[PDB]
Amino acid sequence: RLIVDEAINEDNSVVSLSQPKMDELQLFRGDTVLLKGKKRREAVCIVLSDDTCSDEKIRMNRVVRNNLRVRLGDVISIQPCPDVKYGKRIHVLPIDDTVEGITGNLFEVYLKPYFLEAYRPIRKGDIFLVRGGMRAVEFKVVETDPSPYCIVAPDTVIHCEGEPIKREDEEESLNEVGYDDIGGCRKQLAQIKEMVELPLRHPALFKAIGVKPPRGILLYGPPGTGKTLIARAVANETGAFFFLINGPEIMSKLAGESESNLRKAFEEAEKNAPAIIFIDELDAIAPKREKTHGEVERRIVSQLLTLMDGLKQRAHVIVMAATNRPNSIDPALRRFGRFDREVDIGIPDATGRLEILQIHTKNMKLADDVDLEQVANETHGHVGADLAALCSEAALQAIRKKMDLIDLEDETIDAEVMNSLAVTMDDFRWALSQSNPSAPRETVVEVPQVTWEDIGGLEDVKRELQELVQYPVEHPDKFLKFGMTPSKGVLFYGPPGCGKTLLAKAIANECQANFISIKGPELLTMWFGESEANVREIFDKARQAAPCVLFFDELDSIDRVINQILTEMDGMSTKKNVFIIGATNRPDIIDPAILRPGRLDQLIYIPLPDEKSRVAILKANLRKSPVAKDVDLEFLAKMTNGFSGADLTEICQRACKLAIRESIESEIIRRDHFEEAMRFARRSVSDNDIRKYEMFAQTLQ
Amino acid sequence: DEEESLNEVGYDDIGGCRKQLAQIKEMVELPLRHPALFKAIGVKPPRGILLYGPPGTGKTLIARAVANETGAFFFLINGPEIMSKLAGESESNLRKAFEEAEKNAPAIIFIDELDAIAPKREKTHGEVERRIVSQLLTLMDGLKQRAHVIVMAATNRPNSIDPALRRFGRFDREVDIGIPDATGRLEILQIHTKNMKLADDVDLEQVANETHGHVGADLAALCSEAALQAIRKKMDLIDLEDETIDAEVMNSLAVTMDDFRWALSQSNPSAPRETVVEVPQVTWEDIGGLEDVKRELQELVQYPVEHPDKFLKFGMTPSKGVLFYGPPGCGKTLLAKAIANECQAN
Ligand SMILES: Nc1ncnc2c1ncn2[C@@H]1O[C@H](COP(=O)(O)OP(=O)(O)O)[C@@H](O)[C@H]1O
């Protein structure tokens, strides 16, 4: 009686649970349980343990729900290992269309790396796959004769007789995309699953409910974000039929039968309830422009938005919506009932780029020379499709220097050569050496990681900042119980380049919320273009990125864009626990009419860092570039009167560059470079404006 | 009836793209020259390529050369004769122009002048250009990961190319044919003039120099009306026009330098004046002085591009923007030539 969730570990034969489930039916750490399935299907799976598992919510990969032909959330009774014996005389016959003209019987190439000596058990006639060698192949069990569950021994017969047999079609392959395949976006994909599975997993419960149906969700944002595979993956989860209704073949046909194309595209599967439809790139099919100087696109999108209402409170049609940018979509299309609610997939982050690079490389059989961490760092501002392209032609470069230089080209493939082949680090460098930044440089949402000064500011800036940015997220009602709302916004002002931008990143890292980094000039360049709809769009996608904080700087550089900021900030989503923080250096050229309470009005001064704070930011700086063992951190700050964080980064950048400069200059360490770092000529410090900053400080007093 | 064979062409007939020719060969030879190897490839294929740039750069010859190199079937789907039809059968023309070579795997298709057929503008009134770009977008995706057909796309300037046509997956990584330089112009005139038998008094190298910023089609026109200036002085003055065409007396005639100057009297600026990308020919010893700035720039252009493991020894991004401020005209632009030429940078 355990309920299926999704686990982190890729491997089969893994039960990951919390300890009451293993003490409740005398299970141990090293053991095997039987998996009860529908139509008396059985699967074998070895117990492990973990900590991040909801204890009643058992969590695995796709292989056990492909074995039992079950879905996410079913009930499974548990039978331990001593039902069956050791077993021998095994032989594997795989699927024919998994391979494609492949060399040999492949069990000597694949089944011997399958033996990780953990003795993974095998049910008779079950389904399991081993990845590796540039392409995944599933291994059906056909010609084994043990006792009908077989724990695999190294003494058992690696037998290479059988041909790969024809696929039997009650089961759908794991080459079709799954949830763990789309794992790089370990984020709000989980909650959109959590708000779409209910008519899917509970069809009759939604048949007998009077809930006005959630009948459509938008996945806008950057292209190449797997949205087609998002729909395919949720269809492969819940078993609903998927039909991809793409825009250009709809608009390609002549007038009249394009409507009939929409008719078959709607009710080819309304009788196949539940089912999923998908009308991706809605900018190409549904804009609201006079650029579309015609009427066939209007006749397409009209009655599309009203015969998506073919669910007459007894059907189970559901639509995923995908497009580039939501502002170009028609708003009467976006009107409620016709279309209700919105979410963004957005761009992946570098931390998510780590596991998208991990889970894309399950087949290519990487070597041990690479580390995969430094690969994901420089590719900030790239879509995961571009990373898939990157590792794709990395594999193509790796198979390009081999297999024809050796002149192994023939009509038959050589599986052993490409299985012995592996991708390596300079292959990834060569992949980086092509035109990968075609995914452009837009705004980015990211989970922060800087934590050197995550608890607030310097002195009582800490004690106001930490309460302002994480005491609402556990104590909302305590503020109303003692009288009034939390604050709306706080002001950052003082000397520039002191790490205040990184300080807001550490603030967002402390409260475990997202970070918004909008800067001055990219809003200033579209101030001429008059695209403030994009500005409130990025504000709203920050607002639906709850929890988060919105950090903006150089607000004095704009006064119209600031005026639409003051218009949009009236609907303050404090119950969403998002926050607005504003930064500047010159506080007087901006108007004083934005300083009233209930708005951006709290005016704590951000000081220039002290000598002990200079030692602290030096300690933050030396984590990226290591320091000499002979370092006196007060000696580096003994001549600093107003040296900001930018000045110290300017010192360390040029000192490390001079060290790396003279490290190569010998014919073919850094204490002397620290010595010339504090013993150089210039000490260009803007100390004239700290008097003006204190004039403003005691103007506020 | 049969004309001169388009298949029997030299593979070195293009010479003006020998900075990009190597990697376009290196990106196309795997599905083409290795088809039985490529049907076993589980990596997602190269499915798109885009060649923009200046017009008239032999992209037809590029597609013909790579097709005749790999021996695949070649078809050229040209835009005007497929947009000349009425709606409906022009769509069927596009469908049959996609599917005649699906049975001829592996193959190449050439759908040049995409600017004429797939624009990005609000001026696109009507439905016919929408119905042409649509199902082109989806019938390229009709490859079922077993066919080996592949798009070859030629255009001019990819801003006017539609961004949904420029969709990732719909198009892959893209390259530029660029413009040939004068050093490249030397071998393209060397390979073009194998038929005219130029006189030896010229040196054919300084001829390549003053035609900087020109296309090789204009080079072909330059040698063409140079040859006509060479042969205009005979074949009717002395009247060598016999009952046949006296090919021997005109093949005996040679083109020479004043014919090249008279061909230079025509519209050489009909080439589009475009910004040139090229590894320079002015080197480091051509500029002397300001030695502190010299080794500062020298390390700045050598060690970020050739020793990045030293920069990542600490772990540190190298600097990116250096500044030149001082008196104008001293050679700040001139030292850029040397500092790009020494470290083999474009
Ligand atoms: N979060 C993610 N996890 C895994 N793969 C991803 C992710 N985001 C994007 N991809 C990859 O990007 C590609 C998107 O292909 P494409 O059809 O062009 O875009 P979309 O499916 O978004 O319309 C897919 O092949 C998918 O593997």
Ligand SMILES: Nc1ncnc2c1ncn2[C@@H]1O[C@H](COP(=O)(O)OP(=O)(O)O)[C@@H](O)[C@H]1O
């Ligand atoms: N860089 C170059 N090197 C050699 N020949 C060139 C070059 N650029 C242009 N040409 C010549 O110009 C002609 C271009 O003709 P064509 O391919 O029909 O037009 P387009 O290049 O617009 O497709 C070719 O015959 C080719 O010989």
